[PDB]
Amino acid sequence: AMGQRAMKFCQGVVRELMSKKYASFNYPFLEPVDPVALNCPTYFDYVKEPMDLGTVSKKLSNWEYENLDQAEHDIRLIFQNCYAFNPDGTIVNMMGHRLEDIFNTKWADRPLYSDV
Ligand SMILES: CC(=O)N1CCc2[nH]c3ccc(C(=O)Nc4ccc(N5CCOCC5)cc4)cc3c2C1
């Protein structure tokens, strides 16, 4: 449903967030959380809609988002899950906050207008 300009903007933002530039604090957020492999077996007692950057990218690439608000919701869900599960002071929590700061900076430039 999304037009080309907004779609391209979102794909760019997500790929930048997954880019090597941010490797130092984005790596817990590229793929879906695996509770057992990470020794966090209670993960899905705290989180009910898992989300990750790779997932948002895949949904974008399949034209699954009608609009920037839906894409923004999934992306913010990444960080909301992060903070719901990782207590204050944990390394993953702090990486999540850092990644959200970068996301907000990039997103403030979002296309305000669409037109076909
Ligand atoms: C999001 C969240 O809420 N979690 C809950 C608590 C928690 N604890 C962790 C400890 C370690 C890791 C981890 O090692 N992730 C990791 C991912 C990818 C790679 N690579 C493979 C390919 O890409 C290049 C490198 C290396 C590592 C992740 C976590 C999480 C996730």
Residue numbers in the entry: 301 to 416
Authors' text:
The fungal Bromodomain and Extra‐Terminal (BET) protein Bdf1 is a potential antifungal target against invasive fungal infections. One attractive target is the fungal BET protein Bdf1, a global transcriptional regulator. BET proteins bind chromatin through their two bromodomains (BDs), BD1 and BD2, which specifically recognize histones acetylated on lysines. We show that Bdf1 is essential in C. glabrata, and that inactivation of both Bdf1 BDs induces lethality.
We adapted our HTRF assay to perform a high‐throughput (HT) screen of small molecule inhibitors selective for CgBdf1 BDs over human BET BDs. We repurchased and rescreened these compounds and subsequently tested the 12 most potent hits against CgBD1 and CgBD2 and the corresponding human Brd4 BDs. The structure of 29 bound to CgBD2 shows that the compound's acetyl group forms direct and water‐mediated H bonds with Asn386 and Tyr343 in the BC and ZA loops, respectively, while the morpholinylphenyl moiety packs against Tyr327 in its gauche− conformation. Structural alignments reveal that the binding pockets of CgBD1 and of Brd4 BD1 and BD2 can all accommodate 29, explaining its poor selectivity.
